[PDB]
Design a protein around this ligand. Structure first.
Ligand SMILES: CC(=O)N[C@H]1[C@H](Oc2ccc([N+](=O)[O-])cc2)O[C@H](CO)[C@@H](O)[C@@H]1O
Length: 168
């Protein structure tokens, strides 16, 4: 079996967080969303995750996209399984496999979770040397059943919004 237990709409990072330091900020996991329990799965269900970024691609760095927010500021983005170190670096605007997946035991119950993580990038330095960003939609993640498993009419997709932040 499978059922949806998480939230449909999800905020990434603390509201009006401020960060100091193309220039890439070391924000670690601060601008993130993580939830180990988004679908409940049981009895042989096999599942992975696809991710999709809806932001415009404005550049690239070491093989992944820089996604644009304003003219000063963009983002590097990772999506994946629950633990942050399993994040897949995102490129383009198509659905991408961001977790190869696993299968719960034939006689057990568990959960499937996810994570989204971003790091701010200064694309063009201003004169203000402080930069604000407002609440913006990032994209989505859907579960991907496999091995013949079926979602039935269970909700497959959840969405992410970047909370506003300031760069110093
Ligand atoms: C920790 C938890 O409640 N569920 C996690 C789940 O944790 C597991 C707990 C037990 C086993 N097990 O084989 O005994 C496997 C994963 O693993 C999934 C895939 O990595 C995660 O998406 C999910 O968040």
């Amino acid at each position: 079996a499978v059922s949806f237990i998480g939230s449909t709409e999800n905020d990434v990072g603390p509201s009006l967080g401020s960060y100091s330091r193309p220039f890439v900020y070391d924000t670690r996991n601060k601008i993130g969303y993580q939830n180990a329990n988004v679908w409940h799965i049981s009895k042989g269900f096999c599942v992975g995750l696809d991710g999709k970024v809806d932001l415009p691609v404005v550049g690239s760095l070491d093989g992944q996209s820089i996604y644009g927010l304003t003219e000063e500021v963009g983002l590097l983005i990772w999506m994946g399984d629950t633990k942050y170190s399993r994040g897949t670096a995102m490129s383009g605007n198509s659905w991408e496999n961001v977790f190869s997946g696993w299968c719960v035991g034939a006689n057990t119950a568990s959960t499937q979770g996810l994570s989204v993580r971003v790091t701010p990038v200064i694309l063009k330095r201003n004169s203000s040397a402080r930069y604000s960003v407002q609440k913006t939609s990032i994209g989505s993640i859907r579960m991907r059943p496999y091995n013949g498993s079926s979602a039935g009419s269970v909700q497959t997709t959840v969405n992410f919004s970047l909370n506003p932040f300031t760069l110093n």
